[PDB]
Amino acid sequence: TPTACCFSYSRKIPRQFIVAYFETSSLCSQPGVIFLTKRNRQICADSKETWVQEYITDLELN
Template sequence: ALLCCTPSFAGCTQPILLSLPVGSDPPTSCCFTYTAKKIPRNYIADFYETNSRCSQPGVVFTTKKGREICANPAEKWVQEYMDHFELN
């Protein structure tokens, strides 16, 4: 299912996240765009990394309100958030 771009906070829009069935595997989420702004860490409930079958790497942050936001795993703030949530 394609998630529509919707405002997520402070004027930032949610990048496109596409879930596709891949063979008999469960649906795979892929990021095709990344958020342009750093997400406040206190908005985030969890995260997961996209599947290696996706055309580009991505980290999907799930907010406390249930929104999913794609981020670039190469960005320093994304790596710091991932480390924070893996340790807690």
């Protein structure tokens, strides 16, 4: 897994923009999610939010 930490989380964005995801490294004090977008850019989001878990469960369904 790519080594990176979330310094601040991002606002929700439409599902049609997220293409992948992966949890943050164990070096990060706070567990965060890093979404990969159809623009091939990384976006940090708080895993403790519902829309994040919905994007995650829906991402693994595909």
